[PDB]
Amino acid sequence: GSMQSTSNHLWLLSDILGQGATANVFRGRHKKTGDLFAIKVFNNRPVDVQMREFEVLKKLNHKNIVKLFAIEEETTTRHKVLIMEFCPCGSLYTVLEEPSNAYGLPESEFLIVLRDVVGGMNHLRENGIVHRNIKPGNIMRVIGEDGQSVYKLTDFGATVDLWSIGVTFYHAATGSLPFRPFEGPRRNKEVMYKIITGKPSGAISGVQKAENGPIDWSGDMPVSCSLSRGLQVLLTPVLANILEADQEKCWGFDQFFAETSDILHRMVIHVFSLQQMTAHKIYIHSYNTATIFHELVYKQTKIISSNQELIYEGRRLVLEPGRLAQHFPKTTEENPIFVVSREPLNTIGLIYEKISLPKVHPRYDLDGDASMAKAITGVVCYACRIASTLLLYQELMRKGIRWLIELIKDDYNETVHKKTEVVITLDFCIRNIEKTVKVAAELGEISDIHTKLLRLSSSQGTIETSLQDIDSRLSPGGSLADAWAHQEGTHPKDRNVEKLQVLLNCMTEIYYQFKKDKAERRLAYNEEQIHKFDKQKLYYHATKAMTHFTDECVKKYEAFLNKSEEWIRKMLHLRKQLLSLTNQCFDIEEEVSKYQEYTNELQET
Amino acid sequence: GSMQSTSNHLWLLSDILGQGATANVFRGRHKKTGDLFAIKVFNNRPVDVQMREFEVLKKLNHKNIVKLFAIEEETTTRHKVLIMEFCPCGSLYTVLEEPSNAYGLPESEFLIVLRDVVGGMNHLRENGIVHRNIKPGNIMRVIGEDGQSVYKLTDFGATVDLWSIGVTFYHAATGSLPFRPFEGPRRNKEVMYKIITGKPSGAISGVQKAENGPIDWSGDMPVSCSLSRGLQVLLTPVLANILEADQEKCWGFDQFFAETSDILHRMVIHVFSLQQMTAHKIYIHSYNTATIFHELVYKQTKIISSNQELIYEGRRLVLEPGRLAQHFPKTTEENPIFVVSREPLNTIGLIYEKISLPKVHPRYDLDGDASMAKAITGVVCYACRIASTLLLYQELMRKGIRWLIELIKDDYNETVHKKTEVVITLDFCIRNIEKTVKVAAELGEISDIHTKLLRLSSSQGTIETSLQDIDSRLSPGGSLADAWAHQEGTHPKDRNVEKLQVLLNCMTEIYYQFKKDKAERRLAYNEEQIHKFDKQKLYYHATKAMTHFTDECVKKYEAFLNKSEEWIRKMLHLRKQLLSLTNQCFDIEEEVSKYQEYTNELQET
């Protein structure tokens, strides 16, 4: 267990972090403090041409650049080593190897990557440096003091740069590479070049699904992408315009910097479309107006501004058109603004990818098994993520529905008040006919003023019985009852996700062990069997979860969804009937407000 | 690396799980399946007296009992070994060694322990077995298929049993033993016996704070206990009555079983006292009434039933007195029922223990350092837990306040409607005087009917200007504005807990490493220094957090609290003024409803 060293540092050779053709990178410590540092060792241009170039890099001080502290000579050989900032978490590759990131990073995490990569790039540019090969392996992750990832660039030895940035982001967004010959790019270097050159403009992906088969191009992100629609719509054009073949038509940096900053500077407002059963993230600038917001909601919901009715924390939200977004109420995915419309809409629900388990190859193979373990574990994470979202959609629906009924009831109580505000006036100016009567053209005139008036009271008896009928429907036994939502679908107390997470955790441990078993080239007899046992356990665990997922989570969800679609239908019919009833109270009120002063007479002297 | 074995199982001797004077327990595998099992090996009563006793235990099938599968003979010696259910998570001791449990288990986790221990005990009793020594080391934890802990009893070879159960529960509830001589019970066996025998009845703890110093007795749980007040009030009497010295006065099992089942059968309703700034868990039976609920709230809040005003999801909650608790709205700690009162109450806020860091002993000592690492890490977890709760209290306050203003506004709109419901009637029966007038005891009579009536309209001008004044205070610029709550205290976006958690995680890793360093009796030169380095890092991390905790989390919280206390004061004054104004509209309404038919005259023929 020998180790090399320098005056200030030392490191086991076993503790290697990275290996390149030019150099190796190990994890060592400062001899005097014990502090962890990354050691970059060159095993090996004239000597002082380098002493100069070392100084300028030493000057680089930036958040999204791995810090170069010092340059030392190893002790046994004089070859140059680099003492660099150690990143305990690893790299973006490490992250992307996580099964829970098998279908892309969470949106929140993705945004940190975007931010930090871009800031690092610009700093390089601001100093004239070019990073010929950006890639997930170049991008280190560290935990910031606030618990948030901070990403930092390393290993740099400009349109060409935009390409590898593009591939990385697609990879980061989806967990997969955008350009995939069958089996592998390496396996099919030739198929890959045709794909990249023959890529039609605007396209962001190209997939060969069969051997020597055609390429499925797409301008859209896969369904399995976790990024919100709001973001996909913004992200997509950037990729399309930096993944352009003819460099004649490339976008350029300043434009690139502007378009990404415009995204990064946007805040997110969480919106839930109650009639479509769809959650939405609205990406909007602080200084954009509510008018623009409504337009943005329409783009994702197809609800025109005039039809957009807003609900927040159990009550209506009325936005001044020109109200800036930074002054809006605080929202989360869990606490969104609900949108409803008085116009019928198709109930969509959650759209997700139907993904089945890959087959498990019985042939014992350390490299194959570890690769397989990742894929099968990745699906369940996705399945677990979908299960969570389905529940969220149901929980939000249930909350929103509860709130809307109370809102309608407010309207109902508002209108009942109005009726009782015009009954009173009407009664007084009719009971004041008779009282004044008991004080034949006159009588011929008054009967009209009476009969016609008595028709209004008669018209209100027809309203009264109809409101009581709406009240009847809003009551617990009413046909618009809430009870069903708690009888249908799934609830937190079912703990289906936790039930799935237990299975995922057993599977994830085995995956990591298989990952370990791979690095050790050969197993002992016993360890060989255990690998084969746990291989079978993997499939058993995956099969149980999927059965549970489809039979329990999805099935009960679709039943809840079908009941909602019809229940919505009822709600819309009621509001329309109430509105008609509301307007009649207004029509009556103004007809009564003319016969109130219908006091006309002319008198002698 | 030799290993023993039997026909069906084998196990490394290095992989030991437990060690007793009679036997050792190792973790092994089934030879044919590879499945993990606990192996209990006896190194060593007549032979078949045992073959019989083995069969009855083999029959025991229970959820809270570790399963005994089979009994085999080791291969090299014929001494008897036991194949038992392996519990991957470990024991309650393991759990209690976690720094985040240094001050007791989370309430939810504690309840699973209570449930599972009791069910296991009863099963033993139901079969006549006695478990002479229950203890945290006897109690194994496994993850249930729903992600919830399942606890299972093992290693059994009845008032006396209630004692060790009692100590365990106090230990589980607080993270500490109830009876503690200075330094240690073992260290002071003699001081301990005096404490246990000389313990005054009713007491649940006894602590010697100085060497040869007195004992601080307590009948209450420590402030640092995480259990809700609702539970403490229920748990305390059980402990007091099973920690009784004179076994003459012990409680007995049937009573014990009844009292605990009565607790376990209770559901929890989350309540937040908005005026006291205190969260509460109400432990109530499904079949108990709202009447009883209100009584239960009074016990924790001192708000009498009549004064209890309920709010849920932004709107008033009106409970039928006899409404059963199982039909109540769903609550969480995050989504509680808010309680308010029209009567002044002292603002309490969160009550927690002020705990400072222990001193770190510079003397390198593997046993001492590991013990110290736990304590100092335990405090920060507690500090982290308090930070989270303080934020929760602030977030809930902010939400509740937002809701209450809207509720008052509903009242305000309800009353404005009423005014406009009695103005209309009043106007009609006054404008109908004049209109009827233009058709001297009579005139002498009417002026009264006019003047007195005109006083009511004059009285309503005084109301109108006063309501507009209340409206003025409820508006954004109003003196009862919300804005301050977002300017004061702390918010989720500050990420103070996450900032603290980062520090806690660095500290926790070192603790676990120190725990590892202890087990290995001696360190190499390098490993020796690193232990000393990380020892210093521990203190540095702890000091930074505490500074951040006191200066940032607590300080801003207390400012928010002080502003709330005064803001509440304003709110109460307004509701009282509104009520007075509301009642005047009622007083006026009935005085106007008498002069409406004040139409009296007698006529010839």
Ligand SMILES: O=C(NCCCNc1nc(Nc2cccc(NC(=O)N3CCCC3)c2)ncc1I)c1cccs1
């Ligand atoms: O590849 C290269 N350069 C960039 C990479 C090497 N450089 C650094 N690497 C780290 N850190 C690091 C790296 C890898 C893995 C990990 N961590 C893990 O894998 N973990 C963590 C426990 C979970 C597993 C951490 N820090 C600072 C630096 I500078 C090069 C190749 C050739 C020349 S340069």
Ligand SMILES: O=C(NCCCNc1nc(Nc2cccc(NC(=O)N3CCCC3)c2)ncc1I)c1cccs1
């Ligand atoms: O002490 C005794 N009897 C009860 C205890 C031994 N019996 C069992 N013990 C386990 N499991 C187990 C135990 C200890 C530790 C752990 N796990 C850990 O420490 N972990 C997990 C990784 C985190 C660290 C698991 N299962 C099943 C059984 I039966 C006895 C002493 C003498 C006679 S009997």
Ligand SMILES: [Cl-]
């Ligand atoms: Cl590097």
Ligand SMILES: [Cl-]
């Ligand atoms: Cl045991």
Ligand SMILES: [Hg+2]
């Ligand atoms: Hg990490």
Ligand SMILES: [Hg+2]
């Ligand atoms: Hg996942």
Ligand SMILES: [Hg+2]
């Ligand atoms: Hg998940």
Ligand SMILES: [Hg+2]
């Ligand atoms: Hg009139």
Ligand SMILES: [Hg+2]
């Ligand atoms: Hg596992």
Ligand SMILES: [Hg+2]
């Ligand atoms: Hg565990």
Ligand SMILES: [Hg+2]
């Ligand atoms: Hg904690």
Ligand SMILES: [Hg+2]
């Ligand atoms: Hg915490």
Ligand SMILES: [Hg+2]
């Ligand atoms: Hg009248």
Ligand SMILES: [Hg+2]
């Ligand atoms: Hg650490």
